[PDB]
Amino acid sequence: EIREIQAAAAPTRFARGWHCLGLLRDFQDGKPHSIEAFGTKLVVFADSKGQLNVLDAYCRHMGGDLSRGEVKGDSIACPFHDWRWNGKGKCTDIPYARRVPPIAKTRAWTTLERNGQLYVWNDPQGNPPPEDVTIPEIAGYGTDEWTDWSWKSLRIKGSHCREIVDNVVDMAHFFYIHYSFPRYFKNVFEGHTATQYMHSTGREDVISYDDPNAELRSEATYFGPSYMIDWLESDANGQTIETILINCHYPVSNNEFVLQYGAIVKKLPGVSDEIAAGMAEQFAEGVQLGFEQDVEIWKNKAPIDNPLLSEEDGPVYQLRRWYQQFYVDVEDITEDMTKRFEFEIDTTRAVASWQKEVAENLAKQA
Amino acid sequence: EIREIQAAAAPTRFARGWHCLGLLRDFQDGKPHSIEAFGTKLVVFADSKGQLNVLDAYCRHMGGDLSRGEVKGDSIACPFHDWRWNGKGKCTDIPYARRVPPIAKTRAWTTLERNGQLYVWNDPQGNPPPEDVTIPEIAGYGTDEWTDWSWKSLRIKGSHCREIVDNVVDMAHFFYIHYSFPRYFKNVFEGHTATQYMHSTGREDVISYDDPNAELRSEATYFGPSYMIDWLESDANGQTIETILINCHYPVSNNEFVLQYGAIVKKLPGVSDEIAAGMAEQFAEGVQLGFEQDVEIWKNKAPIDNPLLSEEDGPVYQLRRWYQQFYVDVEDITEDMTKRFEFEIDTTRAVASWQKEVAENLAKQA
Amino acid sequence: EIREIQAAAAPTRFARGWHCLGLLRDFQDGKPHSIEAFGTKLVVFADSKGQLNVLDAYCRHMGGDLSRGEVKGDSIACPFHDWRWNGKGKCTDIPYARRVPPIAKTRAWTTLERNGQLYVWNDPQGNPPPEDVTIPEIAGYGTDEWTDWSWKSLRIKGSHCREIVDNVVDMAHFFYIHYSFPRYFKNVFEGHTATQYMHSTGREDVISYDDPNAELRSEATYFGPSYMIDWLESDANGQTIETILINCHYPVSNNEFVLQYGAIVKKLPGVSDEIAAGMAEQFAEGVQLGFEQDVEIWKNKAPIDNPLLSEEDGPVYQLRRWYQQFYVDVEDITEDMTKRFEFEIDTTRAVASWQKEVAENLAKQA
Ligand SMILES: CCC(=O)NCCSC(=O)[C@@H](C)[C@H]1CC[C@H]2[C@@H]3CCC4=CC(=O)C=C[C@]4(C)[C@H]3CC[C@]12C
Ligand SMILES: CCC(=O)NCCSC(=O)[C@@H](C)[C@H]1CC[C@H]2[C@@H]3CCC4=CC(=O)C=C[C@]4(C)[C@H]3CC[C@]12C
Ligand SMILES: CCC(=O)NCCSC(=O)[C@@H](C)[C@H]1CC[C@H]2[C@@H]3CCC4=CC(=O)C=C[C@]4(C)[C@H]3CC[C@]12C
Ligand code: FES
Ligand code: FES
Ligand code: FES
Numbered sequence A, B, C: 001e002i003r004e005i006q007a008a009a010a011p012t013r014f015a016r017g018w019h020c021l022g023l024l025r026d027f028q029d030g031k032p033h034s035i036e037a038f039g040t041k042l043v044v045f046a047d048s049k050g051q052l053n054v055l056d057a058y059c060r061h062m063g064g065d066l067s068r069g070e071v072k073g074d075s076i077a078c079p080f081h082d083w084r085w086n087g088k089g090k091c092t093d094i095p096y097a098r099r100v101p102p103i104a105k106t107r108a109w110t111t112l113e114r115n116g117q118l119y120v121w122n123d124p125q126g127n128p129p130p131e132d133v134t135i136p137e138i139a140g141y142g143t144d145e146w147t148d149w150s151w152k153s154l155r156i157k158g159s160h161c162r163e164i165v166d167n168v169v170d171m172a173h174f175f176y177i178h179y180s181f182p183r184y185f186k187n188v189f190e191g192h193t194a195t196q197y198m199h200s201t202g203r204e205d206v207i208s209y210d211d212p213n214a215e216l217r218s219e220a221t222y223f224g225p226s227y228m229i230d231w232l233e234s235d236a237n238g239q240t241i242e243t244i245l246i247n248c249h250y251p252v253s254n255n256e257f258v259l260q261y262g263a264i265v266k267k268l269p270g271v272s273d274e275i276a277a278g279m280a281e282q283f284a285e286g287v288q289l290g291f292e293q294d295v296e297i298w299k300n301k302a303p304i305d306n307p308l309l310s311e312e313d314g315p316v317y318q319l320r321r322w323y324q325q326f327y328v329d330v331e332d333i334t335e336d337m338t339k340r341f342e343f344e345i346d347t348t349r350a351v352a353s354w355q356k357e358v359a360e361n362l363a364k365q366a
């Protein structure tokens, strides 16, 4: 009878799509920057104009680390013998030799500079990104109406990055882990994008303040495989506090990945830049604690390809079907991966059950 | 000519039998307790009545760690979504869903609660323990006549647990490592149990006190593969000081194992509970130093399936033949494993040789 | 077009030849000494006379670590059961048993005691060293005219020891890494020995003093695969300061190796033993910083069997052809490995290019 767990070996291959490697301001200071990603090391530097360039970190001459080098003009100087390489990956200048060989070309990585952020496009097939596959421009970033990012990062070891994407369908953990109250849950999976819609409230059995029915309306969408944006809103004190929360990650290796996230808020009327920036901080700091709680779950949990779902669980398999799209060749993608699938959880019993617990635990004091 | 060493790969498989995972008082406090054993993780919790239950640590729903959970009633609540699992391994209650699937069953581990201790039965074939395979009840544990355990543990990395069992036939190390004087040595190997009989004394070249011929009579028996009990006695100050020393271990993985041991003493007449407990402590503290010295031997030694024995060495091969019984299927056990084999070392020359050294080293001072 | 890197798996096999395991004074104190080398552990002890002996560290009886033992007479006493083994590897005496088996023989390692140093000969084929394969005696070590070694060591992890030998042909790194000025460079590769000849000067853009054209004449030769000696000379203050710098290494495993080096100076006329020894120290301390800078290069670099060389690069492939000699059977060596190959780099443009940089960087201050 006993149901056993199925742990298939984690994928050696890495996902095809845009992966966010952090803010432009962090890469716009002239220096190069090493990054261990996709089972190797990349170097990211910024030419005189400002354009950020990305190549393989290992120099083709003697294997030197180009990220330990120095930027000179619009080329990267290797710390070993100061060979110069440009954005496109062609050796421009050898300082002690007359001229360079034409076959001196290294792999340049296709980049996109948007939303105050840097994206790289990994694709083991090696082809450039299509037209319809990209990253949305956020309503109005850059202008004074929205604050700058309260951006933060964690480095996770000992597990695969599949199970951060699994959170898209896990309504129940928001209660028992993050200490919120889901009242609504719907998911939509279109070709290469995966969505979560959620209306959630706080729970009364917590110490300081929020309204008795302080409610938040979330709307999160992976523009897959690794990059999510979340539009958030709560109508309190008359007007609505809009917030945009970014969740994005990238793999280092199959066993390890980096996790990035940040938040900006629209400037409410009658509020300064600092008060606005403080709201963004508090929100990100609150998410910080959230993902810290996930990490302890993720760190101690075992991988499992055969879940046993109840009737209140979201569509795990259809999420992991859609997510399989990115680890396979584009030519081998099937309809069942990119199809339109939608599903809403009947939370009526779930919330009724959670009301018993929240009230029961209030009576215990004082 | 040169004799070479034979290091065959350590067994992936784990031994079949009762393994002691420590004292009942350490698991009787309501909380769950994680334990990494047998190439995986188990969770051990105690229901309301007191009965200790053991299952696989990884939850069948989403792989959550049940040892990071909480006990509610007579079920274990998963820290991920608070699913409830009972002693037998059936899901009893999902708090946010109406009812549970009948196919929600996880692997329960067969347990035995005895001698103030908890044993689990691992057996890769998956069958329950027979009738004649078990653990002896100690003469009279529980009553006031015997003290509670001075119980202690070490965690050993970088070697297999075979070579703690090898100590059963190694008379010579007691001298050069543990600093005792063996006068007698006999071994008996019956079906699934392995015995050592030893009469040993102290050596005069040690600093403080013991009698000039202070003698100890040991009688140790593995009720194999992992669990040993040792009856000890010394007749001093008129009456006999009886002691019972437990040696027991369990594997974490092929490359790592935990080592547990403890001692109780019979209350001598005219002696309080505290003085009695102090004798148990001193003895265990003296063994502590002993096994610490073994660890340095075990840590720096290499594994070796082809020893080169002298004429004063105990039966290594016949010990490792008997010990092979537990890593093979019960159906593939042969007579040579379970046979009656007995052997006594003629120590006459050995002790004569050690008398030269002990006396020689007294003359060096002062 | 893009040129890709070729990282073939590092050799499991270890090089055939003399490897220097350090100074005789460090092994001449009676105690044994463990050493992890050649994918295993060796023990090195010194008999009563003084002769250093080397065997496998793991005792053939029960695998005990002989390096954790004690020397008694001209035999090594095992810390487990004090079995005694002599220089040739025969068990001499079991202290608690009457006599020893004749088949008790362990592997002794062929040694050479010279230049205040100890060499071992590894050779996976197991044959002794020929006549013409050895280590030169240094002009006049031992006498008062030359000081004792300022000897030093580093332990390098995460890379193969091939690429310290690669430095033999890398003129360019001396400039950009070590901050010197190469004016001359020639290499010679005879059967089993590899040579570098270099005339180098300091560069004027450095803070404190040296002459405006303070020049050094280097002459380094690997008596391969692992052992190099370097004769150095600079004619300053009328007479010539001769120096002899040793570079030598040995592998621990394919992924890790130890790096040793030291320097002695000829006593100039009118100079004491201490002033002389201080010159040796300063030189070794200056090399220290040098190899420390290499380690950061070696630590961050990737292995690469397909370099892309310019017209000012030394003969990498012909160095690695000659170096392949030692990882193959002696019977499978070809002419192209042991042939006479010589090559000199036309440095005229290289030095002209480096003069622009050194002068340009002087103008920047103050
Ligand atoms: C108390 C005020 C405060 O500072 N609160 C902290 C921000 S609210 C919070 O951290 C949690 C209750 C929830 C609320 C929104 C949740 C995110 C929804 C989008 C999302 C979809 C996923 O699939 C996975 C994660 C997120 C990013 C959710 C994380 C938890 C959040 C922020
Ligand atoms: C000085 C008074 C004192 O506190 N002595 C410490 C206890 S005596 C001691 O540690 C050692 C000298 C010896 C004496 C009995 C030995 C055990 C016999 C049973 C045994 C069989 C084995 O195969 C392996 C280990 C043991 C548990 C022996 C360990 C060493 C002991 C305790
Ligand atoms: C400033 C005075 C002083 O203390 N100088 C430090 C000694 S000079 C030094 O460290 C470097 C500039 C150079 C000079 C000689 C170079 C060695 C030549 C032989 C050699 C051949 C190789 O293939 C690899 C390394 C060496 C040992 C060279 C290391 C760098 C040296 C010492
Ligand atoms: S390693 Fe990049 S310059 Fe040679
Ligand atoms: S992981 Fe145990 S409740 Fe889902
Ligand atoms: S291990 Fe060397 S004496 Fe037994």
Ligand SMILES: [Fe+2]
Pocket: A167, A173, A177, A178, A290, A291, A294
């Ligand atoms: Fe979460």
Ligand SMILES: [Fe+2]
Pocket: B167, B173, B177, B178, B290, B291, B294
């Ligand atoms: Fe022992």
Ligand SMILES: [Fe+2]
Pocket: C167, C173, C177, C178, C290, C291, C294
């Ligand atoms: Fe160097």
